[PDB]
Amino acid sequence: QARPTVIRWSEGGKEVFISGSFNNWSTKIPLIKSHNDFVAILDLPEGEHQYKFFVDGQWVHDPSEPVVTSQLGTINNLIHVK
Numbered sequence: 001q002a003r004p005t006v007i008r009w010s011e012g013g014k015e016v017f018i019s020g021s022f023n024n025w026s027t028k029i030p031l032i033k034s035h036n037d038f039v040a041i042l043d044l045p046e047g048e049h050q051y052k053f054f055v056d057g058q059w060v061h062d063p064s065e066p067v068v069t070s071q072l073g074t075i076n077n078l079i080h081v082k
């Protein structure tokens with residue numbers, strides 16, 4: 001079922017969390033600092049998920065990864081899990 005999937009945040013900051021449609025935005029999951037990156041490993045089902053980062057107190061998307069407009073009218077990242 002779920003696919004362990006490495007998420008990487010490379011834009012810098014001190015504290016980085018992730019949330020998304022994968023858990024119906026029900027909480028924030030910490031990413032862990034690794035050199036100039038922050039990383040987490042999420043078990044995501046197959047298919048598309050929207051997600052966004054909470055980085056030093058602000059919601060921000062990864063500019064290197066695809067984006068969509070959510071039903072709130074906000075910009076989220078989009079990932080396709082094979």
Ligand SMILES: OC[C@H]1O[C@H](OC[C@H]2O[C@@H]3O[C@H]4[C@H](O)[C@@H](O)[C@@H](O[C@H]5[C@H](O)[C@@H](O)[C@@H](O[C@H]6[C@H](O)[C@@H](O)[C@@H](O[C@H]7[C@H](O)[C@@H](O)[C@@H](O[C@H]8[C@H](O)[C@@H](O)[C@@H](O[C@H]9[C@H](O)[C@@H](O)[C@@H](O[C@H]2[C@H](O)[C@H]3O)O[C@@H]9CO)O[C@@H]8CO)O[C@@H]7CO)O[C@@H]6CO)O[C@@H]5CO)O[C@@H]4CO)[C@H](O)[C@@H](O)[C@@H]1O
Pocket residue numbers: 019025026027028052059060070071072073074075076
């Ligand atoms: O646990 C994790 C977090 O969960 C919740 O957040 C989920 C949410 O996270 C992200 O959203 C961020 C944005 O990325 C930030 O930019 C910021 O948003 C700002 C926004 O940029 C400002 O413009 C402003 O927003 C205004 C709107 O512009 C304005 O239009 C008006 O909003 C009303 C709206 O127009 C109506 O349609 C309706 O909205 C309802 C939706 O239609 C419905 O789909 C459902 O929304 C889901 C959404 O579909 C889903 O994707 C998920 O949202 C993510 C988001 O994609 C992501 O980018 O969850 C929501 C439900 O929570 O419900 C909607 C509301 O019931 O009504 C709207 C309000 O009446 O007013 C807005 C307010 O003035 O202001 C916001 C800042 O508030 O911030 C958010 C995070 O909030 C929690 O909210 C977090 O606190 C948790 O950390």
